[PDB]
């Protein structure tokens, strides 16, 4: 349709006829709105006029007309009839108009899929998601999500390699898209963001998908959304342990302060006071800070799957343990002193790796894990090894039933675990001694420590029995 | 290029004042929310937000100007001027181009700052030679910020 | 030459800035504004339009961009359809500038 050309006139004189045809069909369905297609069995007169009319339509060989009718069906929303044509003519017509409009591309893709041509649909959807057409972020998320699905299934005549490469590009773009969508939503809803800025954020984020650098620098880092920063380091395969840990430290501290604030507001309601202007009260005890913090760690863990570089257990577990000590998230407030260990075990950290780290914590005596607070470190080790023992015992029972002989990867216990418990007993003996000669009077934790000793000895016994042959005889009857 | 969603979260989290602006010379935009500032590369499809929240009072103006010659290391390409209701703050900027075609932005502290005074600052402009001029919505007066590398017993690094 | 660019409902324009290098076809007023001379020495000017919802990129179009686009609409037309479009260019730019644009597009 080159402008300035003089066939336009010829096209316009046909468009006036085609429009009038629309009115006829429109008035037809209108006149016969509520009329049944069959009465007493055979067809009515209102039905026959519908067939006679639509006959004339499908009996035409005017091509500009049939194009105008495809466009018209699309307009009125009749996916009913258009997807049921059969003809390629309509496919070929769509193949030209696809890279141009979202609605048309969706029709094309629908045609492909019903013909088991999933890969071709995934290609159209992906390109559309990367394009500069006016498409919203959420629609780009839907397009990518569909492409991902369609590229993950076999399409005949296309190599596995070509499928996987597309499925992979869609998966990466979908991950980034979801991040961008989380940002945009949070920023717009953020009470501490000026309206003037929000409109600006909506303009640059509710469109084509942006790079991970931009999302980090211009948005996630500026607004201190550290959880999203971490997801971004994951999606970018960001190799930088120090920055990752700095972000973990900021996330923990930010969450702690927020939980503290919410518990304060609550305490004011239960005392009669008034909350700051524009502060929605809490009608129910909010969670203690260590509970909200660990909630944050879980949400991220499930989103990244522990196999990431944003979960270096050797650095992250000591930091969380550090937090617990330095912020009195312990028995004084009614929390389980082993909560940090429980958290990472349920999360699915392998028992061997846990004990391995805890050993390092105990040997190096760093940051807060010093003096008599190593009492706490010993308790964590006791709890970790205890769970490990229980695991080995159940895996033994497990393999006696469903019979066979195996055990790969999983670290297996060595004498080092036994030695570790020996040293742990020494540390306790040392802490108890130092506690008995403190200035001001003996320490109050005498029996508390005597108990821990018994537990540790019990565990060394068990571990010694397993190590000593009771582990190779677990699938045997006693 | 849509505004990142995280900026919308901060903007709608604004208590008193927000503002948007452009650094078109380097393909960056910025948003201020109260005493916090966020920059981002708008050419990037999923930008990361460069956050700067050292400021104590509401930001009223932000600008990117050339540096004064013979003051900073050659790798410093610009100076970021941040005006609040209490002071004006200078930050070193290095906007080095990347393989993708969008400048990589890193910020440097300077210890250069001056108390604002009684006159609002809503407009900041810079000359080719790095001179920084200020004006606002209190009066028609025009101020200039001076700065130098050396500290002196009779003169501060920034005036 | 003028045009109206529509922004969607809700778009409040905040600022507009140049993203490319400042335009200059010469070093003094005479010759300075000669867009035609620099069509192939510096990219067309681009401008970032900041709104409360995003950043829109607006690009200046050169004669060769207009000429190529116009000819792209003449691909499906007559021998006289091109001559008509070409005469528009000659009446505005003159014959030499128009034929130079055709050579460039070619």
């Amino acid at each position: 349709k080159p402008a300035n050309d003089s066939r336009k006139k010829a096209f316009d004189e046909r468009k006036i006829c085609y429009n009038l045809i629309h009115q006829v069909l429109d008035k037809l369905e209108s006149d016969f709105a509520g009329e049944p297609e069959l009465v007493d069995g055979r067809p009515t007169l209102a039905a026959t006029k519908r067939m006679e009319a639509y006959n004339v339509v499908n009996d035409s060989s005017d091509e500009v007309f049939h194009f105008d009718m495809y466009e018209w069906y699309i307009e009125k929303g009749w996916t009913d009839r258009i997807l049921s044509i059969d003809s390629p003519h309509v496919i070929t017509y769509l193949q030209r108009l696809a890279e141009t409009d979202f609605r048309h591309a969706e029709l094309l893709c629908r045609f492909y899929t019903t013909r088991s041509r999933f890969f071709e649909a995934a290609q159209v959807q992906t390109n559309l998601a990367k394009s500069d057409l006016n498409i919203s972020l959420k629609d780009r998320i839907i397009l990518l999500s569909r492409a991902k699905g369609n590229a993950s299934v076999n399409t005949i005549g296309i190599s596995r390699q070509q499928q996987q490469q597309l499925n992979h590009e869609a998966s990466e773009l979908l991950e980034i898209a979801h991040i961008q969508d989380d940002l945009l939503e949070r920023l717009v809803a953020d009470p501490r963001i000026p309206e003037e800025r929000k409109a600006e954020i909506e303009e640059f984020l509710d469109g084509p998908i942006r790079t991970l650098t931009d999302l980090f620098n211009d948005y996630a880092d500026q607004a201190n959304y550290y959880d999203l920063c971490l997801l971004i380091f994951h999606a970018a395969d960001f190799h930088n342990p120090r920055t990752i840990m700095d972000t973990w430290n900021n996330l923990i501290n930010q969450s702690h302060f927020e939980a503290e604030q919410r518990r304060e507001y609550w305490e004011i309601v239960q005392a009669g006071g008034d909350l700051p202007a524009g502060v929605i009260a809490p009608i129910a005890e909010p969670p203690l800070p260590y509970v909200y913090v660990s909630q944050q760690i879980q949400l991220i863990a499930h989103r990244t799957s522990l196999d990431s570089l944003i979960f270096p257990v050797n650095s992250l577990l000591p930091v969380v343990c550090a937090y617990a000590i330095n912020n009195g998230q312990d028995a004084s407030i009614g929390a389980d002193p082993c909560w940090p260990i429980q958290l990472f075990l349920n999360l699915g950290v392998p028992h061997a790796l846990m004990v391995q780290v805890l050993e390092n914590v105990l040997d190096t005596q760093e940051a807060p894990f010093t003096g008599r607070r190593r009492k706490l470190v010993v308790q964590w080790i006791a709890m970790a090894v205890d769970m490990w023992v229980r695991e080995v015992e159940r895996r033994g029972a497990m393999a006696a039933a469903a019979a066979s002989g195996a055990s790969g990867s999983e670290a297996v216990m060595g004498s080092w675990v036994s030695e570790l418990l020996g040293r742990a007993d020494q540390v306790l003996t040392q802490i108890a001694g130092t506690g008995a000669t403190l200035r001001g009077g003996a320490a109050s934790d005498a029996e508390e420590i005597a108990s821990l000793r018994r537990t540790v000895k019990g565990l060394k016994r068990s571990v010694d029995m397993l190590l000593g042959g009771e582990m190779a005889r677990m699938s045997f009857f006693r | 290029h849509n505004i990142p969603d995280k900026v919308f979260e901060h903007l709608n989290a604004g208590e008193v004042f927000t503002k948007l602006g452009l650094f078109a010379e380097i393909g960056y935009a910025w948003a201020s929310i109260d005493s916090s500032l966020f920059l981002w590369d708008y050419t990037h499809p999923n930008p990361e937000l460069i956050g700067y929240e050292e400021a104590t009072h509401t930001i009223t103006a932000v600008a990117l100007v050339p540096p004064k010659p013979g003051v900073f290391v050659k790798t410093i390409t610009h100076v970021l001027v941040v005006a609040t209701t209490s002071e004006i703050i200078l930050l070193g900027v290095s906007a080095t181009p990347t393989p993708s075609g969008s400048k990589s932005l890193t910020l440097y502290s300077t210890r250069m700052s001056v108390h604002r005074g009684g006159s609002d600052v809503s407009f900041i402009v810079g000359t080719k030679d790095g001179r920084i001029f200020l004006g606002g919505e209190s009066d028609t007066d025009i101020h200039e910020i001076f700065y130098q590398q050396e500290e002196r017993w009779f003169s501060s690094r920034c005036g | 030459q003028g045009t109206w660019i529509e922004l969607e409902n809700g778009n409040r324009t905040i600022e507009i800035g140049l993203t490319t290098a400042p335009f200059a076809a010469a070093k003094q007023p005479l010759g300075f504004g000669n867009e035609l001379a620099v069509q192939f020495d510096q990219v067309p000017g681009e401008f970032a339009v900041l709104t409360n919802t995003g950043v829109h990129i607006v690009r200046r179009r050169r004669l060769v961009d207009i000429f190529a686009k116009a000819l792209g609409n003449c691909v499906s037309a007559s021998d006289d359809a091109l001559e008509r479009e070409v005469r528009k260019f000659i009446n505005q730019y003159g014959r030499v500038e128009t034929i130079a644009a055709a050579l460039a597009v070619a």
């Binding site: - | 901060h10 910025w30 981002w40 956050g51 932000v62 | -």
Partner: peptide, 19 residues
């Protein structure tokens, strides 16, 4: 873009109205 570029040098103050 799924490639990150940190650049604290020249940002836009997130906590200020615009010039």
């Amino acid at each position: 873009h799924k490639k990150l570029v940190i650049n604290k040098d020249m940002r836009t103050d997130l906590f200020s109205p615009p010039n």
